Structures are given as structure tokens and as C-alpha cells.
Amino acid sequence: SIINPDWNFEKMGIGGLDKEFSDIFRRAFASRVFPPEIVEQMGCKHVKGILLYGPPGCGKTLLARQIGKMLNAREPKVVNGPEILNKYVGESEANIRKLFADAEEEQRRLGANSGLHIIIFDEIDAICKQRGSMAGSTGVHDTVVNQLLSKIDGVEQLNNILVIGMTNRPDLIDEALLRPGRLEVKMEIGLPDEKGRLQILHIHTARMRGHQLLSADVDIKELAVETKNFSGAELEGLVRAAQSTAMNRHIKASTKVEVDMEKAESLQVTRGDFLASLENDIKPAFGTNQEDYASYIMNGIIKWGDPVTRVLDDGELLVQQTKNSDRTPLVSVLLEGPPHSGKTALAAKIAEESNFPFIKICSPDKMIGFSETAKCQAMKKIFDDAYKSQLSCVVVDDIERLLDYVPIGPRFSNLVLQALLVLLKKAPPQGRKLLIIGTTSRKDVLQEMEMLNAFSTTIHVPNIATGEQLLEALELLGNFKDKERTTIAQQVKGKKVWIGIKKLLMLIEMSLQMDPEYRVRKFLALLREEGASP
Amino acid sequence: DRTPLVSVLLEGPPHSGKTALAAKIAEESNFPFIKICSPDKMIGFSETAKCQAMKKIFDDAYKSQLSCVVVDDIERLLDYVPIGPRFSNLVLQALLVLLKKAPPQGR
Numbered sequence: 052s053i054i055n056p057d058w059n060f061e062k063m064g065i066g067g068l069d070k071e072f073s074d075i076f077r078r079a080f081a082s083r084v085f086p087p088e089i090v091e092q093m094g095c096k097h098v099k100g101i102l103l104y105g106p107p108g109c110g111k112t113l114l115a116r117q118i119g120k121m122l123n124a125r126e127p128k129v130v131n132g133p134e135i136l137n138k139y140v141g142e143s144e145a146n147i148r149k150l151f152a153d154a155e156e157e158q159r160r161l162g163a164n165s166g167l168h169i170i171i172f173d174e175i176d177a178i179c180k181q182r183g184s185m186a187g188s189t190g191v192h193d194t195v196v197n198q199l200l201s202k203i204d205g206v207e208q209l210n211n212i213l214v215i216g217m218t219n220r221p222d223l224i225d226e227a228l229l230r231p232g233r234l235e236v237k238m239e240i241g242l243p244d245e246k247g248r249l250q251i252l253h254i255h256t257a258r259m260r261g262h263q264l265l266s267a268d269v270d271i272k273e274l275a276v277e278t279k280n281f282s283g284a285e286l287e288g289l290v291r292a293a294q295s296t297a298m299n300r301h302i303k304a305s306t307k308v309e310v311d312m313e314k315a316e317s318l319q320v321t322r323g324d325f326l327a328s329l330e331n332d333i334k335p336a337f338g339t340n341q342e343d344y345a346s347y348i349m350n351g352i353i354k355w356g357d358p359v360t361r362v363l364d365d366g367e368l369l370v371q372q373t374k375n376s377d378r379t380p381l382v383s384v385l386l387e388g389p390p391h392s393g394k395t396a397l398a399a400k401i402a403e404e405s406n407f408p409f410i411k412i413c414s415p416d417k418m419i420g421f422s423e424t425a426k427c428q429a430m431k432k433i434f435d436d437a438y439k440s441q442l443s444c445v446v447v448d449d450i451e452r453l454l455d456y457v458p459i460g461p462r463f464s465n466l467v468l469q470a471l472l473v474l475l476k477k478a479p480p481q482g483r484k485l486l487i488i489g490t491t492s493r494k495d496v497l498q499e500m501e502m503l504n505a506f507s508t509t510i511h512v513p514n515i516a517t518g519e520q521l522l523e524a525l526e527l528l529g530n531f532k533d534k535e536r537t538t539i540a541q542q543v544k545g546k547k548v549w550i551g552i553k554k555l556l557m558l559i560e561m562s563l564q565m566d567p568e569y570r571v572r573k574f575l576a577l578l579r580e581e582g583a584s585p
Numbered sequence: 586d587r588t589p590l591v592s593v594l595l596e597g598p599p600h601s602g603k604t605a606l607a608a609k610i611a612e613e614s615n616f617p618f619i620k621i622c623s624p625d626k627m628i629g630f631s632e633t634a635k636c637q638a639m640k641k642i643f644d645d646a647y648k649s650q651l652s653c654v655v656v657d658d659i660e661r662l663l664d665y666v667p668i669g670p671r672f673s674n675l676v677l678q679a680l681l682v683l684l685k686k687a688p689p690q691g692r
């Protein structure tokens with residue numbers, strides 16, 4: 052026998068993955084546990100590989116090494132994908148050839164009695180005549196993946212190998228590498244849920260518990276419910292950062308204060324270090340990024356009147372609809388209005404008030420000088436990342452700039468438009484939700500390009516349209532010392548005021564650059580000059 | 586016997602439920618080869634990639650004694666946009682040529 056029928060995978064390594072082990076062992080490797088006599092009598096061949104895909108750094112290689120060890124196999128021969136590639140002619144294939152040598156010789160001298168060799172790959176998608184389909188010129192020869200296939204299953208047969216491959220993008224894997232007789236069993240390693248984030252944390256902090264270095268203050272259930280969508284590597288980094296910060300705190304404190312030796316030896320880390328590191332040190336990749344909001348909502352949100360509440364309530368209703376309904380797992384919306392009316396800030400607030408696990412903002416500020424194909428790739432990557440969580444919220448910052456629209460011509464890029472139009476109507480995998488919020492300042496152009504037929508709703512962000520609203524906004528913004536405000540109220544009673552909030556901030560700040568005498572007249576003149584009406 | 590190739594086009598207003606009816610008609614035929622070629626899985630491809638993909642999906646249907654292929658959202662395959670107009674000539678030509686090519690004898 053090679054293992055007891057029920058196997059075992061816990062406390063020695065792998066954390067939150069326990070169903071995965073049973074599934075893989077019941078599906079594929081059932082031919083190496085049955086009694087050998089019946090296996091020989093039946094006359095069946097064993098599987099010759101498996102494939103594992105999923106997020107990056109979620110615990111794939113550990114499972115590979117464990118499965119290799121538990122079969123009573125020789126030491127694994129790891130190798131990395133992009134490393135076997137050379138500019139010389141006919142040298143990217145000698146590298147592939149130079150990995151099956153020992154197995155070949157051992158099968159040569161000893162036939163049908165050898166052991167097993169595991170040849171774990173990594174980033175197996177680098178060598179594939181399929182990445183060239185996507186826009187660009189990268190043919191990767193297409194001879195490399197004809198020298199690997201011809202060795203696994205060719206005119207000469209090997210019966211003492213087991214190839215395990217891992218990849219991050221399952222959609223660029225060549226089709227000729229998944230037929231029966233070759234890599235022929237797929238499997239997914241998803242993100243860890245609550246129980247996994249508990250087990251991994253328990254595993255990674257046993258040593259410090261053994262010597263009682265950890266204080267009794269810290270719990271683990273609290274830290275297993277705050278970390279949402281963390282991957283295991285992130286948890287390990289969190290523990291390490293907590294250790295380091297506690298160490299630095301203790302050294303600094305005991306150095307500054309000549310404490311007695313009792314606490315000097317004691318190196319308790321407490322819980323404050325944990326929360327400090329969690330909130331200041333580690334930044335997840337598949338979770339909320341609480342830092343960039345401060346770069347968009349720069350001056351809070353002021354309630355100058357009625358419309359703000361209406362907009363926020365509509366956003367709440369759409370969020371609620373997408374959260375708790377079936378038969379409709381994809382929802383869209385579009386915010387539009389006159390320029391400088393504050394459309395981005397409201398979108399950011401609506402997204403933030405949802406409390407979703409995964410929030411992302413795709414704006415053109417980070418695509419300066421990009422060619423259009425790069426923009427398409429970036430958008431596709433963001434959406435792909437968003438597809439890997441139970442709930443999500445993706446914002447598109449400015450749709451008129453993504454297309455490079457210019458009134459002369461008109462001119463724009465077709466590729467981005469078509470990619471967006473296709474992506475707005477693609478449902479996620481079964482059982483997962485999504486929500487998309489747009490933004491723009493030219494509704495008519497999008498209406499003309501047949502783009503307003505893909506969105507599902509629309510919201511209007513009105514502008515300051517009366518003197519009373521301007522007066523209330525100024526009062527809440529707290530300027531002009533309430534005495535010049537009486538003259539301002541007298542002057543702005545006309546009610547023919549059409550100005551944006553951001554422009555209002557700019558005008559107030561500009562007018563505040565003179566002495567108390569001419570400030571009011573300067574501000575009134577500036578407002579009157581820019582007083583264009585619909 | 587004197588007509589080994591047929592075609593049909595479903596048309597109507599938007600949001601009318603055309604793809605569902607096409608799929609339901611296809612699934613109710615009991616043909617041994619049944620494929621679908623939609624633009625939902627070609628995001629970011631250039632024109633030549635689309636041509637090669639369509640040609641590949643069509644080539645297989647000539648290796649089976651029966652088949653039924655479906656082409657979905659012809660408008661999005663050609664990259665149409667009312668401004669201009671603009672579109673991909675090469676894909677249109679490939680489609681116009683593939684719509685009138687009978688399979689090898691018998692099929």
C-alpha cells in the first residue's frame with residue numbers, strides 16, 4: 052500500500068484545503084491504492100498528470116510537494132517556466148529534453164519496477180503557441196510545445212513519470228495539452244474563507260504560543276473575521292510584520308525608560324501591534340484599498356440641498372437590488388451632468404457606502420501615454436480580478452477620456468469602445484454578483500454611439516440653480532464672516548445663478564487673496580463674469 | 586440530395602430574445618456536432634485572430650457527417666459603429682466567402 056484509504060492532510064502543512072485533497076485523490080490517483088494484484092489483472096494504465104489553477108500565492112506548490120511525498124516518490128525536480136527560453140536556435144528545446152534523462156535511464160536498466168518521478172512545472176503557459184492570438188507579435192516559436200508533448204507520449208513509452216503543472220491564467224493554455232493520455236485532470240484552488248483564515252492563523256503562530264511569548268490579550272477569531280479575502284501569503288506577512296513591530300516597540304521603550312529587568316526580558320507583543328500593522332502595514336490585493344479614497348473625496352461631501360439625498364438613496368436601492376436577488380446578477384448605472392458638478396466624488400461615496408469586500412476604481416490617471424491595446428489589456432485584467440470574489444464593485448472614472456474623443460473629426464479608438472461594449476454584458480461565473488458604475492459629462496455622444504442601450508439606468512447630477520442654494524452652500528462651507536454675507540445675499544437674490552461646486556471652491560479661494568476691503572467686490576465680479584445660463 | 590447547405594437569419598428589435606430561440610432550435614435537432622461562435626470570448630483580439638478562430642471552428646464541421654454551427658451577434662463581429670461608419674473588411678469578406686462553401690462530398 053501507499054497510503055491508508057482515508058489519507059490525512061492537516062497540522063503538518065496545508066491549512067484551509069481539506070476537501071481539495073479528498074476530491075483529487077478520489078478522482079485520479081485511485082489506481083495506486085488498490086491491491087497491486089487486481090490492478091495487474093485488470094490491465095489499466097495510470098494517469099500521467101494533473102493541472103492546478105487559481106489566484107497567485109494561494110497555496111498551490113505546497114499541495115504539489117505534499118502529494119509527491121505521500122506517494123513514496125523520489126525528490127521533486129522543480130523548474131520555472133520563463134527560464135527555459137533562449138535566443139539561440141534549437142536551444143529552448145534541449146532544456147526541455149534535459150529533464151527526462153534520469154527516468155529514461157532508470158527505465159532502461161530496470162523495466163517495470165522503477166519508482167515515480169515528479170517534474171513539477173511552474174507558469175506552464177509561458178511556452179504556448181496561443182498567446183500570439185492576443186494583439187501583438189510573440190510567437191514563442193511553437194516548436195517548444197512540440198518537444199514536450201513528443202516526450203510524454205511518443206513512439207517510445209515511459210511508465211514512471213507524473214507531470215504536475217500550475218498556471219495563473221487558464222485561458223492561454225494550448226488545446227493540444229489537455230487531451231486524454233496527457234494532462235487530463237483539472238482543479239481549482241480558490242481564496243480561503245473564514246475557517247481557512249482561522250486554521251492558517253492557528254498554524255502560523257504555534258511556535259510563539261509554545262514559549263508563551265504571545266500575550267493572553269490577542270485572540271484569533273477577531274483577526275479571522277476582519278481579514279476579508281486575504282490570501283495565505285498575506286497572513287504570513289501580517290504575522291511577520293506584527294512580530295517586527297512589537298520587537299521594535301519593545302526595544303525602543305525599554306531603551307528610553309530604564310525599566311527593571313523583569314519587563315526588559317519580557318517581549319510581549321500584545322494586540323495593539325497586531326491592529327497597528329494590520330491597518331498601516333499590509334495592503335491586500337483582492338480587497339478594499341482604503342487609501343485612494345482620500346485622493347478623490349478631498350473636501351468631504353456638503354449637503355447644499357435636496358438632490359444629494361436623492362442620488363444617494365438611488366445608489367442605495369441599486370446596491371440592495373444587486374446584493375440579495377437572483378435571476379439578475381449583473382447591474383449597471385450611469386451618472387451624468389454638466390462639467391465641474393462633482394460626479395466622481397458622489398460615485399466614490401456610493402461605492403464606499405456599500406461595504407462590499409472588493410472595490411476597485413479604473414481611472415485614466417494611470418494610463419498616460421499608453422497605447423490603446425495597453426488600455427484594453429488593463430481593463431480586461433481589472434475585470435478578471437473582479438470576477439474572483441463573491442461580491443464586487445468596479446468604478447469607471449471617465450468614459451469620454453478612455454475613448455480619446457475629440458470634437459474635431461470626430462476621432463476616437465474603436466478597440467476600447469468595442470471591448471467595453473462587450474464587457475458590459477458578460478455575466479460572471481455561476482453564483483457570483485457584480486456592480487458597475489459609470490461617469491461622463493457628454494450624454495449625447497454616448498447616446499449616439501449606441502452605448503446608452505447597454506446600461507440599465509441613469510441618474511442626473513444637477514447643478515446649483517438658485518441663489519438660496521448658493522447661500523446655503525456658502526453658509527455650510529463657512530466663509531465671508533457672515534457680515535459680507537448679507538450683502539452677498541442682497542446681490543444674489545436674482546436667482547439666475549448657474550455654477551458648479553468645484554468652480555465655486557476655486558472662485559472663493561481666488562477671491563480670498565486680497566485685503567478685507569476689495570474681497571467682496573472681486574468675488575461678486577468674478578461670479579457675474581462667469582454667470583452663463585443654460 | 587441537391588441542397589447540401591442551408592442558412593437562416595433571425596432578426597428583430599433589441600432585447601427581444603433571439604439568442605435563446607436560436608440555441609433552443611439548435612439543441613432540438615439531435616445533430617452529432619453542435620458548436621457556437623460568439624464574440625463573448627474574443628475580447629481584445631485583432632482582426633486576423635478573429636479570422637483564424639472562425640476558420641478553425643468552421644474547418645471541423647467538414648469532418649462529420651452532420652453538424653449545425655451558430656454565429657451570434659454578427660454586428661459585433663464586424664465592429665460596427667454608426668459614426669463613420671467603420672468596420673473590419675477582412676472579417677466581412679471571410680464570412681461572405683464561408684457562407685457559400687459546400688463541404689466535401691456527402692456531408
Ligand SMILES: Nc1ncnc2c1ncn2[C@@H]1O[C@H](COP(=O)(O)OP(=O)(O)OP(=O)(O)O)[C@@H](O)[C@H]1O
Nearest residue numbers: 348349350351352353390391392393394395396553
Ligand atoms: N456635494 C458635493 N458633491 C460633489 N463634490 C463635492 C460636494 N461637496 C464638496 N465637493 C467637492 O467637490 C470636488 C468634486 O469635484 P470632482 O473632481 O468630482 O469634479 P468633476 O465634475 O468630476 O470633474 P471633471 O468633470 O473635470 O472630471 C471634491 O473636492 C469634493 O470634495
Ligand SMILES: Nc1ncnc2c1ncn2[C@@H]1O[C@H](COP(=O)(O)OP(=O)(O)O)[C@@H](O)[C@H]1O
Nearest residue numbers: 065066067107108109110111112113251283284
Ligand atoms: N493553505 C495554506 N496554509 C498555510 N500556508 C500557506 C497556505 N497557502 C499558502 N501558504 C503560504 O504561501 C507560501 C507559498 O506560496 P505558493 O502557494 O507557493 O505561491 P504560488 O502558488 O505562487 O507558488 C508559503 O510560505 C506558505 O506558508
Ligand SMILES: [Mg+2]
Nearest residue numbers: 394395448449
Ligand atoms: Mg469627472
Ligand SMILES: [Mg+2]
Nearest residue numbers: 603604657658
Ligand atoms: Mg444575443
